[PDB]
C-alpha cells in the first residue's frame, strides 16, 4: 500500500555520466558506447552566448579542445559532430557499463526520471513530467546541463530528455537525445518565455484512482456526465481536452476500481467548483497532475 513519487533506479545512468570541458565552460556528458552526448553550448563562452553561431564554433574547435573525464580516466576524443542542439564526441574507449538503451521523444504529460549531475558526478534523482507548455519543473543549478531524463523498462533505459537551460520563471527546458528541443525554445540567452501551461487531465484522473486504492474516496459521487459536457467544463478551467484514447488508457484503472471513467470526470468536475474544504487527497491539498496512468499501475499494482 501507499502512493509516492517514485523515480527509476538511477544505477544504469550513473555509469554513463561524464564531464565534458571546452575551454572554461563545463557541463555533463552522457557516455554511451564510444559516443558522448552533451549540450552544444559547452563550446560557447560567457561573451558569445547572447547571439551565438554554433556551426562555426564547432569548426573553430578540434578534437583536442574537448576534455572528457570519466572519474579518473581522461577519454581521448577521436571525433566530433553536431546534431541539432547537442554535441556527439566519439571517444577511443567504449563505456563498459553501457546498458541496453534507446532514444525516444516523449509527448507532453509523460513522465521520466531526472538524474541531476554536476561536474559529471550524479547528485540526485527525481520524477519529472513533460508539461503541455513543453517545460519541466525541475531542480537545476549552474553546471547541470547534460543531465538526462530516462525511463527504465526491465533493463532498457529509454533516454528522452537532456537538460540545457532555465527559463526566467523558474522552469527548465531541454532537448531529446537527438538535439531537438521540447517547445519553441532555442539554446541562446535571448528573451524567451514559456507559453501558458495547462493541466494534464489523465494524470489527475489516474492520481484520483490511486487515492481510491489507498482509501481516499470522499471526492467520489453519484453524478455521471458526458465527455463533451465534462470538456465544456474542462476547457473552462482549461484542463487539457480529454480524448477517447485518454478514456481508453484509464480503463485498466477503472476496471480495478469498478468506477467508470465518466463517473470520475464528474468527481473531477465537482472538485473544481467546491474545492477541498480543508480535506487532503493522498496527503496533498491540491490536484497532482505529475502522475501517469502507467506510474499508478506500476506502484499500486504488481
Amino acid at each position: 500500500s501507499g502512493f509516492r513519487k517514485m523515480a527509476f533506479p538511477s544505477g544504469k545512468v550513473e555509469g554513463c555520466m561524464v564531464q565534458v570541458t571546452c575551454g572554461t565552460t563545463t557541463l555533463n556528458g552522457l557516455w554511451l558506447d564510444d559516443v558522448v552526448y552533451c549540450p552544444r553550448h559547452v563550446i560557447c563562452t560567457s561573451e558569445d552566448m547572447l547571439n551565438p553561431n554554433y556551426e562555426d564554433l564547432l569548426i573553430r574547435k578540434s578534437n583536442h579542445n574537448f576534455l572528457v573525464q570519466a572519474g579518473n580516466v581522461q577519454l581521448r576524443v577521436i571525433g566530433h559532430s553536431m546534431q541539432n542542439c547537442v554535441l556527439k564526441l566519439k571517444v577511443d574507449t567504449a563505456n563498459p557499463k553501457t546498458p541496453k538503451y534507446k532514444f525516444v521523444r516523449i509527448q507532453p504529460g509523460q513522465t521520466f526520471s531526472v538524474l541531476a549531475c554536476y561536474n559529471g558526478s550524479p547528485s540526485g534523482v527525481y520524477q519529472c513530467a513533460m508539461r503541455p507548455n513543453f517545460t519541466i519543473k525541475g531542480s537545476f543549478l549552474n553546471g547541470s546541463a547534460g543531465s538526462v531524463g530516462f525511463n527504465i523498462d526491465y533493463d532498457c533505459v529509454s533516454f528522452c530528455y537532456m537538460h540545457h537551460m532555465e527559463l526566467p520563471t523558474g522552469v527548465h527546458a531541454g532537448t531529446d537525445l537527438e538535439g531537438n528541443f521540447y517547445g519553441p525554445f532555442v539554446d541562446r540567452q535571448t528573451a524567451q518565455a514559456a507559453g501558458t501551461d495547462t493541466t494534464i487531465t489523465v494524470n489527475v484522473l489516474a492520481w484520483l484512482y490511486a487515492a481510491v486504492i489507498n482509501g481516499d474516496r470522499w471526492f467520489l459521487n453519484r453524478f455521471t456526465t458526458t465527455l463533451n459536457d465534462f470538456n465544456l467544463v474542462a476547457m473552462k478551467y482549461n484542463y487539457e481536452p480529454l480524448t477517447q484514447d485518454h478514456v481508453d488508457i484509464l480503463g485498466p484503472l477503472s476496471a480495478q476500481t469498478g468506477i467508470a471513467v465518466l463517473d470520475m470526470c464528474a468527481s473531477l468536475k465537482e472538485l473544481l467548483q467546491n474545492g477541498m474544504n480543508g480535506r487532503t487527497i493522498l496527503g496533498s491539498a491540491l490536484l497532482e497532475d505529475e502522475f501517469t496512468p502507467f506510474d499508478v499501475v506500476r506502484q499500486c499494482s504488481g
Partner: peptide
C-alpha cells in the same frame, strides 16, 4: 533565460 553550464 540562463544556460545552465558553468562558465568561467
Amino acid at each position: 533565460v540562463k544556460l545552465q553550464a558553468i562558465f568561467r
